[PDB]
Amino acid sequence: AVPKRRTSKTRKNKRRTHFKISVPGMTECPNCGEYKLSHRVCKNCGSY
């Protein structure tokens, strides 16, 4: 029910090894405009 001992800095930081986010798909809109998300459509700010 309750923690018996406090958690140290090193154990807390080991537990957060996998707690991250990843970079998205990001294909480039060739005809006009900047990057867009892949398999998506950007009617404005992109020709694709």
Partner 1 sequence: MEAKAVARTIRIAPRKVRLVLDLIRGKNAAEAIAILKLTNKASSPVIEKVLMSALANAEHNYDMNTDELVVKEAYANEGPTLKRFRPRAQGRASAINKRTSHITIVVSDGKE
Partner 2 sequence: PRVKGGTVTRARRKKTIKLAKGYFGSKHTLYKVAKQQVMKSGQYAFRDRRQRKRDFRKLWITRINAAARQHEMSYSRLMNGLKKAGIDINRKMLSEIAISDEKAFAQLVTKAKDAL
Residue with Cβ nearer RNA (6 or 39): 6
Residue with Cβ nearer partner 2 (10 or 44): 10
> Hey, which residues does 27 pair with through a beta bridge?
36
Residue 17 has phi, psi (to 5 degrees) of -60, -45
Distance of alpha carbon 39 from alpha carbon 42, whole angstroms: 10
**Which region, left, alpha or beta, applies to residue 20 given φ > 0 means left and ψ of -120 to 50 means alpha?**
beta
Q: Is 43 in the site for RNA (CB under 7 A)?
A: no
| Interface residue list for partner 2 (CB under 8 A) | 8-10
| Interface residue list for RNA (CB under 7 A) | 6, 9, 12
| Interface residue list for partner 1 (CB under 8 A) | 20-21, 23-26, 34-37
